Amino acid sequence: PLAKDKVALLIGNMNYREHPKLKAPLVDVYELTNLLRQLDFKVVSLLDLTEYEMRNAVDEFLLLLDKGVYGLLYYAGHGYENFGNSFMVPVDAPNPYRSENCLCVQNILKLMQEKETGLNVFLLDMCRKRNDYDDTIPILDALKVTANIVFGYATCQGAEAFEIQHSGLANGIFMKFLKDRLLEDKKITVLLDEVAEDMGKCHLTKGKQALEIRSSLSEKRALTDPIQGVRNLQWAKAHELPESMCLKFDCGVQIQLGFAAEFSNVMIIYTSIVYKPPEIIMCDAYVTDFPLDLDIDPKDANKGTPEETGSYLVKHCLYTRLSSLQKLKEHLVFTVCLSYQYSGLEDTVEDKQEVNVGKPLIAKLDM
């Protein structure tokens, strides 16, 4: 079979306010994004979204879906299952919380079908235990018989989904298996079946985590299926990075500013000193004063390597990881500081400069 298009929305939540924080959805979303891109999928990958931001991204993803389109949703983060309904808990959920604070997977499925899609996939990598505080009973409409829905659950109903206890850049249990299977040219249902068998050999989560697959899919569809023959225009607008610039300073210092796309809402900036006058015996390329709405801790800014900022990027530059680009109200303006000293002079000299990069990556969808 063929797909009209292959689009995917990926959300990874970790930065919970009143709930325990996670580490692995960063790696999980990052890895699944690369694997889906290899499979011709157009991916939008978001980290730590609040209820409003999850609702806006889900809604716009549904609008992009259409007759014959392969839609894939991935969620890694906090979740619960009550009376057969799965809920995705956003980072801004209160403790305790109810269904009005969360997003209903079952409700999203209804909307996916309305756009007459060819294949619908929900890889929900979350816990499925009861949220006893939520005492509401949900009266929802009966889904249409479409025979094209595949549900990849990381755990069974009433059980938890696991990741390794805060130990570096390791994936969660679901992703540890799914990544070495995803690119296979077999039916999406059979590929998930193999993932269940691999998982059932892991010792860490025996009797605590098993993969649940719920499918209605009749046609032999796969994520590898080719594309035949407005969506691309709107999707390209959310993946634009500011171009490399040169900061020539008063004392003759030429700095280089590079930009990289880590996630759809995460961008890395890297400063390199490309020209240093011979009388400047000491100089530091700082990057200070970022929008307060982004929330950039100076203890995490300007690191020798991308790794000490939380990045997965590929000379003598400092890295700064700018997360929450979707929280930008105004344009991205920041200061590039210069702390220099002369061959002779005793005290150090200060030199500022303001840089406007606008609304990078998802920040272009000004909400």
């Binding site: 996670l22 938890e160 696991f162 990741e163 390794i164 969660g172 860490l204």
Partner: peptide, 4 residues
Amino acid sequence: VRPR
């Protein structure tokens, strides 16, 4: 294992 941290659950999620």
